[PDB]
Design a protein around this ligand. Structure first.
Ligand SMILES: O=C(O)C[C@@H](NC(=O)c1ncnc2[nH]ccc12)c1ccc(F)cc1
Length: 164
């Protein structure tokens, strides 16, 4: 059901789209969230996905943290996708604006290999502060399963495709 995506490799596809609108249209098995270790979904992709769930994502996330403690940078957990997908894979890429190690970006993308197909944002890009051209290269060199990337910023999408 994914449509209008540009094929970058055998398994990586990309589109200039709002991941919330894409998830509402496709209802994928898995939507990836650009999470932090506390699952505090304030801004960026996380804030937008949580708002689309009417805060149900944050209520579920707070119960998960109260039981399990925080995730590791480079780690993930599978929770409900609520009204957006069957599941949400919350993945923690390093936040360069918080001083985190960019070398953990490959470990973050490895979580995608546990799922046959995913709708996802570009990890550690945007307000997480990493070079998005680097994030796209690590994605295509790490993920082996079928990944549909939704890039919100139009200017960024154009820059990523022309430089790929
Ligand atoms: O412009 C971009 O694609 C990069 C940016 N993505 C979004 O904020 C983004 N991407 C897709 N759908 C969206 N809907 C509402 C926001 C949103 C970003 C990626 C990872 C991250 F950790 C933080 C931000």
């Amino acid at each position: 059901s994914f449509s209008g995506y540009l094929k970058l490799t055998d398994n990586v596809y990309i589109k200039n789209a709002d991941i919330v609108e894409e998830a509402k249209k496709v209802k994928p098995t898995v939507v990836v969230n650009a999470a932090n270790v506390y699952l505090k979904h304030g801004g960026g992709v996380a804030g937008a996905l949580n708002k689309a769930t009417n805060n149900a994502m944050q209520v579920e996330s707070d119960d998960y943290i109260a039981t399990n403690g925080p995730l590791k940078v480079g780690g993930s957990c599978v929770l409900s996708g609520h009204n957006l997908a069957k599941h949400c894979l919350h993945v923690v890429g390093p936040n360069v604006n918080k001083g985190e190690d960019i070398q953990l970006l490959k470990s973050a993308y490895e979580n995608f290999n546990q799922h046959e197909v995913l709708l996802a944002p570009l990890l550690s890009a945007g307000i997480f502060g990493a070079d998005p051209i680097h994030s796209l290269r690590v994605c295509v060199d790490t993920v082996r399963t079928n990944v549909y990337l939704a890039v919100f910023d139009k200017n960024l999408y154009d820059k990523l495709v022309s430089s790929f």
